[PDB]
Amino acid sequence: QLTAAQELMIQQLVAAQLQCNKRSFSDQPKVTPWPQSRDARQQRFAHFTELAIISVQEIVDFAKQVPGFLQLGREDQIALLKASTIEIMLLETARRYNHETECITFLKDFTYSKDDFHRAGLQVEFINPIFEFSRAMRRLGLDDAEYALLIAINIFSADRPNVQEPGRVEALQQPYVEALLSYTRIKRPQDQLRFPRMLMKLVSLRTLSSVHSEQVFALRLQDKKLPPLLSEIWDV
Ligand SMILES: CC(C)N1[C@@H](O)C(NCCCCc2cccc(S(N)(=O)=O)n2)=C(c2ccccc2)S1(=O)=O
């Protein structure tokens, strides 16, 4: 059984995620509209980069609500968020993938297909893994609690670059891993391999993070510049 502390924490991560989602779709009409070459492709790219900026702000606001994140130094708080942002973005992207339409819905009604992603200015080398991962995630069928716990485990990764106190980070990850392991045993007691399969997704997210780095490097060669916010997180 889950302890009262485990239950309240799980519910709090779920509540923190619903709140980020609610205040984001509320602040949706303040995004460059989605519209033939030149100017329209520039506008399409500006639209797509603005959605990423909203997600970075959302992730930062969620992290602050994650118990234990405020125990870390400002230094390590940045180091963890810097590396986790895209991995969290991809997890959330997989969560808004529709099997019937083969489309990802950002915010409230912004719906995108594989073609729409290529129109925004992304490589097939990066689009295919997104949808490949989105379909792979659909097969697990994670609830709001399992998604929230996975993000918390992803945030508190001690092996991230520039982490001054990895011991502190590893100690903070432990209660979340314990919570997900307990939740899994309660939810589906028949499927013992549900928990390792969720952790195998963290393995996949690291490869996807490298693919995303290759996508950013490709944009520099394509003379497409990133906004000041996204440049701070995703550049050499
Ligand atoms: C050109 C570079 C800088 N890129 C982009 O401009 C971008 N824009 C879309 C941002 C997704 C916003 C998003 C994610 C997840 C959840 C919610 S939300 N607001 O609906 O909760 N929004 C990327 C992206 C695409 C798919 C998955 C992850 C990243 S990119 O890094 O290739």
Residue numbers in the entry: 219 to 253, 259 to 459
Paper text:
The liver X receptors (LXRs) alpha (LXRα, NR1H3) and beta (LXRβ, NR1H2) are members of the nuclear hormone receptor (NHR) superfamily of transcription factors that function as heterodimers with the retinoid X receptor (RXR) and activate or repress gene expression in response to binding of cholesterol derivatives or synthetic ligands. Transcriptional responses of LXRs are known to directly result from ligand-induced conformational changes in the receptor: similarly to other NHRs, in the absence of ligands or in the presence of antagonists, LXRs form complexes with corepressors, while binding of agonist ligands forces the C-terminal helix H12 of the receptor to fold into the active state that creates an activation function-2 (AF-2) coactivator-binding surface. Reaching isoform selectivity by rational structure-based drug design has proven to be difficult since the ligand-binding pockets (LBPs) of LXRα and LXRβ are virtually identical. Since the adverse lipogenic effects are considered to be largely driven by LXRα23,28, drug discovery efforts have focused on developing LXRβ-selective compounds.
In this study, we compared AZ876 with structurally related compounds AZ1–6. These compounds have a central cyclic sulfone amide scaffold with lipophilic substituents on both sides identical to AZ876, except for the tert-butyl substituent replaced by a propyl group in AZ1–3 and AZ6. The third substituent from the core is a larger elongated amine linker that is different in AZ1–6. The amine linker is mostly lipophilic with a polar group at the far end. The compounds AZ1, AZ3, and BMS-852927 have the highest affinities of 2, 4, and 3 nM, and the compounds AZ6, AZ7, and 24,25EC have the lowest affinities of 161, 105, and 133 nM, respectively. Analysis of crystal structures of LXRβ LBD in complex with WAY-254011, AZ3, AZ6, and AZ8, as well as of previously published crystal structures of LXRβ31,40,55 reveals that GW3965 and BMS-852927 are the only compounds not forming a direct hydrogen bond with LXRβ His435 and therefore they do not stabilize the His435–Trp457 activation switch crucial for the agonistic conformation of H12. Other agonists form shorter hydrogen bonds of 2.5–3.1 Å essential for proper position of H12, which correlates with their activities both in LXRβ HDX-MS and functional assays. Overall, most of the selected compounds displayed similar differential HDX patterns with a strong protection from deuterium exchange observed for the peptides lining the LBP: central part of H3, H5, β-sheet, and helices H6, H7, and H10/11.
